[PDB]
Amino acid sequence: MRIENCFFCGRPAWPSKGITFMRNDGKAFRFCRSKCHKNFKMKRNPRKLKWTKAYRKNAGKEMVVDSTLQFAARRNVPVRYNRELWQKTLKAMERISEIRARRERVFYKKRMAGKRAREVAAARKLVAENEHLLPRLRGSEKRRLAELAAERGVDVEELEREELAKLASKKKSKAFGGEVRRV
Amino acid sequence: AIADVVAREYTIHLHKRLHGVTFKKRAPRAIKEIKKFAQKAMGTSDVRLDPQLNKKVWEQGIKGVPFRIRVRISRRRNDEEGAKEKLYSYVQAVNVKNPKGLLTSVVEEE
Amino acid sequence: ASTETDLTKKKITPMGGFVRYGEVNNDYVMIKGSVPGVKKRIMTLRKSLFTHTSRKALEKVELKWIDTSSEFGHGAFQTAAEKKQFMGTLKKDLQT
Amino acid sequence: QALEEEEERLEKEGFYDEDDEEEEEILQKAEYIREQHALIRNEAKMR
Amino acid sequence: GVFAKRTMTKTRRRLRDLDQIERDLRSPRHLQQYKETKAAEDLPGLGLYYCIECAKWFESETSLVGHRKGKPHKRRLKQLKEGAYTHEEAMAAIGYRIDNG
RNA sequence: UAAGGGAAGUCGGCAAAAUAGAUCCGUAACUUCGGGAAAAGGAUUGGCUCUAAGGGUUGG
RNA sequence: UGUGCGAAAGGGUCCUGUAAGCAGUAGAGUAGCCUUGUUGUUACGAUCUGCUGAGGGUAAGCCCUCCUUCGCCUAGAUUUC
Numbered sequence: 236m237r238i239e240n241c242f243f244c245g246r247p248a249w250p251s252k253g254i255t256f257m258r259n260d261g262k263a264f265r266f267c268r269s270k271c272h273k274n275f276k277m278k279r280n281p282r283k284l285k286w287t288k289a290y291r292k293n294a295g296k297e298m299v300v301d302s303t304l305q306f307a308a309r310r311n312v313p314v315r316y317n318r319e320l321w322q323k324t325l326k327a328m329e330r331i332s333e334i335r336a337r338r339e340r341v342f343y344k345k346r347m348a349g350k351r352a353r354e355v356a357a358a359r360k361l362v363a364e365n366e367h368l369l370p371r372l373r374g375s376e377k378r379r380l381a382e383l384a385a386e387r388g389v390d391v392e393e394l395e396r397e398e399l400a401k402l403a404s405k406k407k408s409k410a411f412g413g414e415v416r417r418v
Numbered sequence: 419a420i421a422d423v424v425a426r427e428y429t430i431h432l433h434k435r436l437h438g439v440t441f442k443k444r445a446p447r448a449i450k451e452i453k454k455f456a457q458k459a460m461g462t463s464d465v466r467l468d469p470q471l472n473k474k475v476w477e478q479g480i481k482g483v484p485f486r487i488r489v490r491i492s493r494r495r496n497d498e499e500g501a502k503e504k505l506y507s508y509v510q511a512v513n514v515k516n517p518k519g520l521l522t523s524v525v526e527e528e
Numbered sequence: 529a530s531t532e533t534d535l536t537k538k539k540i541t542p543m544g545g546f547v548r549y550g551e552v553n554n555d556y557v558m559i560k561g562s563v564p565g566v567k568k569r570i571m572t573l574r575k576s577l578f579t580h581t582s583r584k585a586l587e588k589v590e591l592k593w594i595d596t597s598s599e600f601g602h603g604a605f606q607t608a609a610e611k612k613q614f615m616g617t618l619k620k621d622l623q624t
Numbered sequence: 625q626a627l628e629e630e631e632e633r634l635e636k637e638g639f640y641d642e643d644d645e646e647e648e649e650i651l652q653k654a655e656y657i658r659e660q661h662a663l664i665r666n667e668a669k670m671r
Numbered sequence: 672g673v674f675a676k677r678t679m680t681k682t683r684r685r686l687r688d689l690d691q692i693e694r695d696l697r698s699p700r701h702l703q704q705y706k707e708t709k710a711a712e713d714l715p716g717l718g719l720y721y722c723i724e725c726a727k728w729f730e731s732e733t734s735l736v737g738h739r740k741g742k743p744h745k746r747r748l749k750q751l752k753e754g755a756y757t758h759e760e761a762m763a764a765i766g767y768r769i770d771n772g
Numbered sequence: 773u774a775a776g777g778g779a780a781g782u783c784g785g786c787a788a789a790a791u792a793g794a795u796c797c798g799u800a801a802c803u804u805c806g807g808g809a810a811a812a813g814g815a816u817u818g819g820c821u822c823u824a825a826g827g828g829u830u831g832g
Numbered sequence: 833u834g835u836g837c838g839a840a841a842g843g844g845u846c847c848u849g850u851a852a853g854c855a856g857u858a859g860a861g862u863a864g865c866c867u868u869g870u871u872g873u874u875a876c877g878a879u880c881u882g883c884u885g886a887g888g889g890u891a892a893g894c895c896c897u898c899c900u901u902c903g904c905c906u907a908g909a910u911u912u913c
């Protein structure tokens with residue numbers, strides 16, 4: 236047996252999975268699932284459906300140029316069976332898989348490099364426009380810190396900073412409404 | 419170990435409790451499952467809902483009940499004379515940014 | 529669930545487990561066809577009362593492959609490693 | 625063998641080499657601001 | 672509007688595909704085979720007025736020049752300009768190939 | 773709602789499905805010349821950005 | 833009193849199909865300001881591209897989780913040679 240691939244989306248097609256369409260010109264179309272089969276019957280383009288490997292290649296979101304992608308091919312010239320060749324092939328398959336995985340991760344990071352700079356710029360703009368929503372001590376808490384600093388001879392700004400630390404550590408959500416007392 | 423008067427915040431997954439329910443009955447059943455959840459959590463058969471919690475349930479009509487709702491249930495003492503139940507639960511809706519990703523928490527008394 | 533021609537090291541349990549059952553961690557019996565019960569149900573296996581008369585009883589079974597894809601949907605992968613290898617890197621992979 | 629030679633060449637060149645407190649603080653403050661905006665929108669949706 | 676939209680996706684209502692349309696445009700022998708598959712006397716306008724892009728027969732030259740101004744013909748032109756989806760593109764999408772020696 | 777088939781069903785296509793608005797091409801026999809006729813058979817219809825035509829008053 | 837039960841949550845597995853928002857010498861054209869055109873410029877503008885197989889849902893008859901949190905427990909009532 237062998238593992239085929241879906242014509243429409245590109246997923247691995249295993250035995251008894253999906254359905255094959257035989258056309259009168261002599262071409263056969265293997266689909267992994269009824270989703271791909273029904274989209275094909277609705278004449279949707281796989282290149283425009285964003286969940287397909289066709290779209291991902293056309294958008295450049297899959298690693299398409301690599302040395303590790305040259306090892307798998309449809310071999311139309313058979314090789315006489317050789318036990319040593321098959322075992323070294325299996326070892327090659329493992330090593331190729333590992334190398335391909337690391338190179339794919341590098342490719343994804345090179346796609347996603349600029350995110351940190353964009354997010355930092357957006358955060359700076361948001362903070363600059365909304366400085367007034369930053370956490371703040373209560374007026375009663377400020378007065379109590381001021382009188383405690385006057386009593387203990389300590390720094391009111393210092394007391395304010397550890398109180399900001401405490402109210403930053405303690406997160407309390409507010410509830411809607413409230414019970415009405417019965418008569 | 420746990421006192422009679424106690425408030426906890428819970429996340430009720432109303433989606434699995436309203437799966438397959440008739441459209442004209444989804445929101446009233448949601449009210450009843452909120453009462454049943456509070457009774458199971460606090461042991462109190464007397465459950466009183468906040469009108470804001472009712473608005474939160476009914477916000478998108480009779481069949482647009484949210485999948486998750488973040489509630490605070492407060493078990494309190496019934497001080498009214500001649501009361502069959504000495505304890506009751508009061509359930510309020512909680513203002514959180516997103517009802518997902520939250521654990522059951524105990525509300526501080528202060 | 530590994531065979532002599534499929535060298536993938538894997539157990540009989542599908543991805544995501546058996547639907548409404550769980551995971552098979554004990555010895556299991558694979559039976560051609562269907563059986564009278566449902567999932568979770570107690571099955572009684574019995575020896576045949578008579579000597580068999582068919583060649584199918586004397587046939588030796590050689591498995592080439594066992595499906596271990598998910599039965600909670602249209603599963604296309606036999607292992608989670610295969611799913612990761614096909615999909616590639618995700619957003620949560622860099623976030624973690 | 626060619627793949628292994630290319631791989632060791634790339635590791636020598638730093639192909640697989642992987643790489644601020646002020647940035648972390650400004651991101652945390654932005655997340656706090658977004659949470660406050662969500663709470664304000666929830667109050668409006670309630671009322 | 673689409674005539675009998677309920678059974679549009681049946682196999683007995685199937686239309687010619689865009690890759691076959693590309694083959695018909697590039698090679699006249701393929702189009703000749705497709706036309707020999709049909710009977711000319713039962714065709715609209717005796718088969719004399721045919722749009723290869725829309726893979727469709729028309730009753731008159733006025734009708735054919737008429738549909739050419741319409742948007743279905745223009746969407747077919749746009750899809751042909753983009754290119755039909757084929758097996759070699761499907762193979763390149765997964766990075767697979769054929770070794771013929 | 774239903775794959776494939778498409779009246780094989782039934783006394784009987786009963787019931788259902790199919791058609792349908794508008795613009796344009798086009799429209800037979802028959803006829804009391806008025807009709808038939810929306811006969812039949814076809815092409816098309818979204819969004820957006822534009823262009824053109826269709827008026828009134830004042831001014832030498 | 834447990835390899836317990838329940839409510840959440842995390843992970844998985846599936847379904848859909850790429851979220852809000854921001855940005856772009858992408859964008860048919862149109863109108864202003866001036867260097868009167870040299871992406872002239874600014875503005876509007878379906879859509880496209882990137883952030884983004886993302887966002888959302890997931891047991892209600894899916895799976896895993898002494899070792900991610902919180903809670904519950906040795907009852908109550910009735911009957912029996």
Ligand SMILES: [Zn+2]
Pocket residue numbers: 241242243244245246266267268271
């Ligand atoms: Zn597929």
